[PDB]
């Protein structure tokens, strides 16, 4: 509710609007989706690679992030990219058919698109439930962009050098979220909302750990790793 806190919220909202296209116009640039085992890999690999760029673009605008060292910025983005991707995907996720609907039937993704290969259901079943539970929080867009930023600036990520500064930046955002809920999220929706949002960050860590397991299996098959992008291999590697 402070002038500084409103400043943070305005920056994070504009940063999100600059890095998330609700028209999904750029999806034409991706390799084409095909729906028959790994038929969707080239299209979805380009989707993830595109989204990593947008997550980095959002991360740059977070107040205090640029004040970090270059190496802490890389550690934070490497460990959080897939978590922010899962978070930011909730905007396109719909509970009608439990799918990410990005504007066209070709750009609608369900469990069968992603969970037919290997053990990928061990990630997709918990991921859909996370999407369902996150949607049922009905967050304000202000709260959506704060949670993404809090997720990125995490002091406990492995390999963080300066950790006190990461904590100071995250607490600035965390105190902005808690004060926002009290001041503009009315009851009953705001009941326990901050604690439920923090719990979603814990769900993301287990989804992150499961994603790491499936990527390692996917990447060890060179024929499948050929289908990825250079940025995905660099970040998820």
């Amino acid at each position: 509710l402070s002038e500084e806190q409103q400043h943070i919220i305005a920056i994070l909202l504009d940063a999100h609007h600059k890095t998330y296209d609700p028209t999904y116009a750029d999806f034409r640039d991706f390799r084409p989706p095909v729906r028959m085992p790994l038929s969707m890999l080239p299209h979805l690999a380009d989707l993830v690679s595109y989204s990593i760029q947008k997550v980095i673009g959002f991360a740059k605008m977070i107040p205090g992030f640029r004040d970090l060292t270059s190496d802490d910025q890389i550690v934070l983005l490497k460990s959080s990219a897939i978590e922010v991707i899962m978070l930011r995907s909730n905007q396109s996720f719909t509970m009608d058919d439990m799918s990410w609907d990005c504007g066209s039937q070709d750009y609608k993704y369900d469990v069968t698109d992603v969970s037919k290969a290997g053990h990928t259901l061990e990630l997709i079943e918990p991921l859909i439930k996370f999407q369902v539970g996150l949607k049922k929080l009905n967050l304000h867009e202000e709260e959506h962009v704060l949670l993404m930023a809090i997720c990125i600036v995490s002091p406990d990520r492995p390999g963080v050098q300066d950790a006190k500064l990461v904590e100071a930046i995250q607490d600035r955002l965390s105190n902005t979220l808690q004060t926002y809920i009290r001041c503009r999220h009315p009851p009953p929706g705001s009941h326990q909302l901050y604690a439920k949002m923090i719990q979603k960050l814990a769900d993301l860590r287990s989804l992150n750990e499961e994603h790491s397991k499936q990527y390692r299996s996917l990447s060890f098959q060179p024929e499948n790793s050929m289908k990825l992008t250079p940025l995905v291999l660099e970040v998820f590697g």
Binding site: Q53, I56, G57, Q73, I74, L77, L231, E234
Partner: peptide
């Protein structure tokens, strides 16, 4: 050793 990500930064 992360040229593309550091360039995006």
């Amino acid at each position: 050793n992360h040229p593309m990500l550091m360039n995006l930064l």
